[PDB]
Amino acid sequence: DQSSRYVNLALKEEDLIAGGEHVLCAYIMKPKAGYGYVATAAHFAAESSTGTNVEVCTTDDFTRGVDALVYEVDEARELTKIAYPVALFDRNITDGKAMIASFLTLTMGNNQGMGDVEYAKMHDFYVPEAYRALFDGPSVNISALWKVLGRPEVDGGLVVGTIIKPKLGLRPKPFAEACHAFWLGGDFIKNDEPQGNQPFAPLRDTIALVADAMRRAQDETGEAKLFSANITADDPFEIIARGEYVLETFGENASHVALLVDGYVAGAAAITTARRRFPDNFLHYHRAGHGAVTSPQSKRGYTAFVHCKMARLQGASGIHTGTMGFGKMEGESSDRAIAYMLTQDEAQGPFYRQSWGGMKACTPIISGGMNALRMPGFFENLGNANVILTAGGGAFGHIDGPVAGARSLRQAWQAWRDGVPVLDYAREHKELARAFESFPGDADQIYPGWRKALGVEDT
Amino acid sequence: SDSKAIAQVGTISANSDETVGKLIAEAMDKVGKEGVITVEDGTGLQDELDVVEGMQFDRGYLSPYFINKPETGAVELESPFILLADKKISNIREMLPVLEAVAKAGKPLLIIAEDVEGEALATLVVNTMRGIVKVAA
Amino acid sequence: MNIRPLHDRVIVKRKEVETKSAGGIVLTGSAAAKSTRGEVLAVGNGRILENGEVKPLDVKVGDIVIFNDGYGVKSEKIDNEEVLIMSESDILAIVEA
Amino acid sequence: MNIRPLHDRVIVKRKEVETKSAGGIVLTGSAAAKSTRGEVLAVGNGRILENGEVKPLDVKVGDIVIFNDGYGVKSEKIDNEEVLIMSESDILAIVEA
Amino acid sequence: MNIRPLHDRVIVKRKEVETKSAGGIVLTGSAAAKSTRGEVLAVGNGRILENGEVKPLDVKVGDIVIFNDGYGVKSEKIDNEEVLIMSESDILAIVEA
DSSP: OOOOOBBBBBBBBBHHTTTTEEEEEEEEEEEEETSOOOHHHHHHHTTTTOOSSSSOOOSSSSOSSOEEEEEEGGGGGGGGEEEEEEEGOOBTTTSOOOOHHHHHHTTSGGGGOOOSSEHHHHHEEOOTTTTTGGGOOOOOSHHHHHHHHHHOOSOOOBOOEOOTTTTTTHHHHHHHHHHHHHHHSEEEOOOOOOOOSOOOOOOHHHHHHHHHHHHHHHHHHTTOEEEEEEOOOOSSHHHHHHHHHHHHHHHGGGGGGEEEHHHHHHHHHHHHHHHHSSSSEEEEEOOOTGGGSSTTTTOBBBBBHHHHHHHHHHHHHEEEOOSSSSOSSSSOOHHHHHHHHHHHSEEEEEEEEETTTOOOOOOEEEESSOOOOTTHHHHHHTTOSSSSSSSSSHHHHHHBBTHHHHHHHHHHHHHHHHTSSHHHHHHHHHHHHHHHOHHHHHHHHOOOOHHHHSSSTTO | HHHHHHHHHHHHHHSSOHHHHHHHHHHHHHHHOOOOOOOOOSSSSSOOOOOSSSOOOOOOOSOOOGBBTTTTTBOOOOOOOEEEEEEEEOOOEEEEEHHHHHHOOOOOOEEEEEOOOOOHHHHHHHHHHHTTOOOOO | OOOOSSEEEEEEOOOOSOOOTTTTTBOHHHHOOOSSSSEEEOOSOOGGGGOOOOOOOOOTTTTTTEEEOTTTTTTEEEETTTEEEGGGGGGEEEEEO | OOOEEEEEEEEEEOOOOSSSBBBTTTTOOOOOOOOOEEEEEEOOOOOOOOGGGOOOOOOOOOOEEOOOOTTTTTEEETTEEEEEEEEEEGGGEEOOO | OOOESSSEEEEEOOOOOSSSSSSOOOOOOOOOOSSSSEEEEEEOOOOGGGGSSOOOSSOTTTOEEOOSSTTOOOEEEEEEEEEEEGGGGGEEOOOOO
């Protein structure tokens, strides 16, 4: 609460950014009607730090060091830019890197319990150039997934994954078999957001059965694959139990494990917990209930830009970003722009220009899904592919469904990275021949005349 | 070694209850020297002894439609063949020659397998319901 | 209504699908199988190519044939029946005898 | 059933698979290997292209051949046997003796 | 066995691989190199295109040739030796004399 001292527009963005004095968050914030905007933005900064509610004391009144401050505010453009003391984000004991539970607590969570903020969508932020290397940070990410997959640590591109067909009600071993089938296809999978310990398919049997399915699928394909276990729980120690179990369950492939956290329903405590004991494993942020915040049905909480840019901060090795081809506008929360922001360590956001030395990359995770042929178009717009797919029939309406199409759209990048695009690897890889054959909805126009060079009779 | 002497050491260790002495002396006889005895909480006021003979294990029918004795709520097959698949069953492709051969023999079949997926299970359900082959999985 | 395929087109109907007598015995469930076999319903005037005279296609109405049921094969609703439209090349073989 | 391929088409059946005598001695397990060799069952009347006369195909029934087992080759069920159907261009060479 | 490649096809065997005398002296390790040079074992009857007469292929048995050891060549097992099959267009030149 309070606006006094919390208005500090005299703070220079240069020393805050380049001097690294503060974490700097740009909010598109609108108050409720009749509230003073600058007071609301400053009052929102108090919720974004110390709280300071009714009264603060230390046996002798006052408290004045913890405050995150507004440093640019402008009512008519709905802009609220808040600068956060680096002391707000207390260092995790596992690595000395700041607990992202604080950051969410101070941006899109307990601080959003402020009611006279109608919404405060953060469109961008900055994190101090040096101390950034001591943000929670994704000690595993796409780059380490590349390493366990045997890809080069630079531009190992698309780690292909799916939302298992037909989504809910698929029992653990049919689900594991759908994972096996998919892993006769591609590379990566998650549990669904209800597929925790919920009785239709609990985690332990599913992850045991899914892990077997992964080893079977690996043995039957000669290439490594990955699963994201839904560790999301109401008890952080049950989350740890799910995380430990999946690592112990995959065992010789424990480094293959991903940790699906439905971070919005799980909270950043669950995210921070799933990053803690599991630094050598892929924290998969997922977006249960996100219609309350990121979707256009709401203006509150995160934009998809900061949603995933903070997934970098989270040490969420990846995050459900939305859909890879993003409409209307770019830079402003485009998944394509996010894929830069997460996978290239030098990028411009809609309010801040930032580097990402020392803290490492983050992985965009794609729902809905481009076909295997449109994705080299996204790759050509992204100039890389360093993302994860996690989609259904949009990418996996292949003639082999989730299977061969999921190999195909990995190799679709590899051809793009060779500067040949996907045409060449569809000549090389049968799954991509079947993918041009499966996706004429884009295939016959996004990458020209495959039909004569690719395949034989009727492709 | 005699039943009476064992019933005493039972009674004494039970703190002087003849009922357990008799009960344990009975159990030791019926299960044989290699048999195994266990104890668990009952429900009625009386103690009770359940003896299981042959082989038993804690797995049921994979579908209710296999119930061929709905008055009992149970499955029974007589003179069945037994197929032991150390695998998933996923496709009837896998089953066709076996089911034909069992269909050739006309005897019912029990399937004990790692799992029987919906496609195979549904196909067995149709063929068992329509009486082409008696099958349980 | 009769229909005239306008050269190289052939009109057919598929035989029965998922024949319920696999191996002659087991009443198979659905497996998304589709028969590659059909009956020739209409045949085009011939082949227009090479500026030669329009030579006829070798199949005739009432032929039973094996055809590649690929995406290039279209299908249409006529008299509420389903029918299939294809080139001669899409037919693989004739079911003789 | 006998079948007549409708020009340029050729039909074969595959030889034995995963012959259990690697080096003539060791009984191989499965390695997902498949034989590229088969016996010619029927041959089309000839080649229709270029306005020329329908010249015959060079293989004949009872030939044993090496073929490119690529996506152009389709497969079909006849007499409950499997059979394979291909262009002449998918046959690579003829195996004598 | 003898084999006749069926028009435009040519059969070759590769020359020796990874000659152990780099600069004639240094024994190269395995360096993924494969000889573009092989000896022609059999040559097809000719080329059938364009309705001309079947002119023969320009290579003959016992020619030693540089070939594109690329995606076009295919390979088969015969008399337990390996051999390669390619179009004439795979062969880039005859190293003569």
